[PDB]
Amino acid sequence: AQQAIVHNNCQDTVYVQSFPYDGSATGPLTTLQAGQTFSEDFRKSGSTVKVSKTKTLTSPMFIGYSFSSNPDYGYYELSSEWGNPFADKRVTLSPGAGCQDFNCAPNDAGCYSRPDMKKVYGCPLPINVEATLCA
Amino acid sequence: AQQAIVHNNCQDTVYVQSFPYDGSATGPLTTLQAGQTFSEDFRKSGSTVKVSKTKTLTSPMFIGYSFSSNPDYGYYELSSEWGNPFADKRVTLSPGAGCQDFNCAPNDAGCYSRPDMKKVYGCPLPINVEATLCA
């Protein structure tokens, strides 16, 4: 199966949880200590994978993956709309070769998808979507 | 309500035609004199809009669009994968404010979506997908 993956390279522990775009029940609340990795098989409806520094999911960054009419593409989004605990760190999000990455340098807020500057990238299926926190 | 639009600001007559993703009939083969504009209502299934300097649509540029719900995004691609008659001129493709656009300078070949580097963007609905040739 296609994978949504979040690598925690931060010193700090993070919490990751995937909220399907169809609005159904989420995946398990996942604790990632330094060096640990979250992964899940792609949810059929797409999902927003929230990443927070608290168990209560305060002000999470999210990694979104979704699909469209055009059956050829998957779409991914690295968003600071609701917050970003890693704003002073590097965060990368990649669908693999042949498509655009997010490679967001420390303190480069304008690299992320923003409420009034949305950044959602498309890429031919199949894809894995792989992020590193504190790259 | 949403429209896919092609403004021909070039000195040349151009030809535009839409090819629905769901296989329904092609749109009218549209001749745009220098200065004229093509437009169509958003097709539910999405579409490929070919843009060429010949009526036979040989080696055309294309504008691709589609849209989804949950998330409610519209997707748009400015592609030179099949050719680009307007490579020596400026071409823009914008969904309106608040989202990543294409603004492809004259002879900036890498600005377009390419076979080995796809460039497809998403934006919250509703949008008009609006291209200007020789901007």
Numbering used by the authors:
A (entry chain B), B (entry chain A): 18 to 152
What does the paper say about this structure?
Magnaporthe oryzae, a fungal pathogen of rice blast, is the most devastating rice pathogen and causes a destructive decrease in rice production in epidemic years. MoHrip2, a novel elicitor isolated from M. oryzae, is an exocrine protein.
In this study, we solved the crystal structure of MoHrip2 by X-ray crystallography using the single-wavelength anomalous dispersion (SAD) method. There were two identical protein molecules in an asymmetric unit, and only one monomer is shown. The short helix was located between the β9 and β10 sheet. MoHrip2 contains six cysteines that are involved in three intramolecular disulfide bridges, which occur between cysteines 27 and 151, 116 and 140, and 121 and 129. On the basis of the crystal structure, MoHrip2 showed a high similarity to the three-dimensional structure of a large family of proteins containing a thaumatin-like domain despite the low homology of their primary sequences. Of these proteins, we were interested in xylanase inhibitor TL-XI, to which MoHrip2 was most similar in three-dimensional structure. The 14 amino acid residues located in the middle region form the functional region responsible for the HR and the disease-resistance induction of the MoHrip2 elicitor. These 14 residues include a β-strand within a β-barrel and part of two neighboring loops.
